[PDB]
Amino acid sequence: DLSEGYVFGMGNPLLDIIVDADDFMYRKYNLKKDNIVLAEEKHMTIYDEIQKKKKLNYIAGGATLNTVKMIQWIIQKPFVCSYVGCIGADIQGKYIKNDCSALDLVTEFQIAEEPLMTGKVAVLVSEKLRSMVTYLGAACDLSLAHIEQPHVWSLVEKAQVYYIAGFVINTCYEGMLKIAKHSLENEKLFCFNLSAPFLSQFNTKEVDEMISYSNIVFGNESEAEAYGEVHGLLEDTVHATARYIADLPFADGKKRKRLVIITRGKNPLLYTDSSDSEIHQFMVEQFKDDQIIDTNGAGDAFAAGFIADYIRGKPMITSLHAAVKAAAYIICRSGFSLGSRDSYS
Numbered sequence: 348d349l350s351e352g353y354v355f356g357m358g359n360p361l362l363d364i365i366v367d368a369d370d371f372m373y374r375k376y377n378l379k380k381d382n383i384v385l386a387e388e389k390h391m392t393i394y395d396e397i398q399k400k401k402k403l404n405y406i407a408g409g410a411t412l413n414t415v416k417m418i419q420w421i422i423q424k425p426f427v428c429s430y431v432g433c434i435g436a437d438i439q440g441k442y443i444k445n446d447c448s449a450l451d452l453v454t455e456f457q458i459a460e461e462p463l464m465t466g467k468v469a470v471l472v473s474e475k476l477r478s479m480v481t482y483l484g485a486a487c488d489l490s491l492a493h494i495e496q497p498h499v500w501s502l503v504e505k506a507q508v509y510y511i512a513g514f515v516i517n518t519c520y521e522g523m524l525k526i527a528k529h530s531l532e533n534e535k536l537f538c539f540n541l542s543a544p545f546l547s548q549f550n551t552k553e554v555d556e557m558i559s560y561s562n563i564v565f566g567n568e569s570e571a572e573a574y575g576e577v578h579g580l581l582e583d584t585v586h587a588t589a590r591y592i593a594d595l596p597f598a599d600g601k602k603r604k605r606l607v608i609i610t611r612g613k614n615p616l617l618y619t620d621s622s623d624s625e626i627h628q629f630m631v632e633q634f635k636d637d638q639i640i641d642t643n644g645a646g647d648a649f650a651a652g653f654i655a656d657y658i659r660g661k662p663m664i665t666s667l668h669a670a671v672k673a674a675a676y677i678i679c680r681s682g683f684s685l686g687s688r689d690s691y692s
């Protein structure tokens with residue numbers, strides 16, 4: 348029985364535009380496998396280009412939004428989760444706003460001044476490669492002033508659990524930092540995600556600072572390798588990274604338990620904490636090739652699945668199984684599609 352607004356999240360509300368991309372698209376825009384890049388000017392043509400293609404799938408995205416709204420979806424109790432993001436005054440943001448409302452996710456969306464449109468992600472799907480080109484758009488306009496509003500900040504004060512992806516470093520770092528400081532101050536549960544390799548590479552200061560406030564840190568193999576290399580962890584990078592992140596001092600220099608979970612695709616995930624001396628591996632659900640529909644958002648679902656159980660008192664191993672289940676459910680679906688709740692289990 349969790350109170351209303353028990354879980355709070357802020358991030359980038361984005362519209363995923365999923366397309367069966369031709370192979371030349373990856374060479375043309377210099378896109379890499381399973382990677383994500385913020386759109387530069389040289390990428391801008393990709394949005395009108397994929398628009399000329401048939402069978403586009405428009406579906407609400409945003410890493411933080413995916414996770415938080417699935418937690419709300421899993422819990423089934425109305426208004427247990429609340430989300431804050433910046434959309435634009437267009438039909439895309441209206442769709443995202445109604446999508447959240449449809450599953451009882453409380454939202455205080457900031458609206459970017461026209462004509463700044465809501466962010467969009469070009470999800471290029473092919474048999475050989477999957478890659479994302481993200482245009483943040485309105486999501487950048489997410490301000491501290493909006494968060495510091497009385498009616499908006501009240502959602503933060505009532506919350507006992509926070510989830511903020513590393514992606515929000517590029518849009519509103521002062522906001523997520525102010526909340527992280529509040530969380531650690533009131534001994535709350537702060538959950539953070541490494542989100543992408545480029546964040547550890549180009550925003551190393553912000554990532555490490557967030558970790559110092561985080562009680563639970565999520566990451567995958569590529570993010571662990573990128574993080575480890577930047578921190579000079581040359582030998583056994585992935586394991587050394589998990590240990591390093593768990594062992595980092597908190598901001599107030601107090602002794603707390605920070606949980607770290609590194610996912611590794613089909614391979615067993617790793618986990619440990621600041622008290623544990625060992626790094627444990629946890630096996631994952633095995634898939635046949637024709638069973639895998641779309642792995643995009645699997646990591647977002649994993650976090651949702653774990654947190655939803657963990658904050659309800661479920662043991663570590665039990666919560667890990669729920670996390671895999673959430674990810675596996677998304678894998679069998681195209682985009683971050685949350686179907687009827689009755690068909691989950």
Ligand SMILES: Nc1ncnc2c1ncn2[C@@H]1O[C@H](COP(=O)(O)O)[C@@H](O)[C@H]1O
Nearest residue numbers: 567610611612613632645646649671674
């Ligand atoms: N190919 C896969 N086979 C089985 N599980 C997967 C696969 N890809 C992703 N997952 C699940 O989603 C989580 C996150 O995946 P990843 O972002 O690739 O590390 C994993 O820990 C698994 O629970």
Ligand SMILES: Nc1ncnc2c1ncn2[C@@H]1O[C@H](CO)[C@@H](O)[C@H]1O
Nearest residue numbers: 359361408409410468481514644647
């Ligand atoms: N820069 C970003 N900020 C927030 N979410 C993102 C970003 N790039 C991709 N995503 C989202 O990540 C999800 C995949 O985990 C997709 O739904 C996509 O919309």
Ligand SMILES: [Cl-]
Nearest residue numbers: 358359410411
């Ligand atoms: Cl986000």
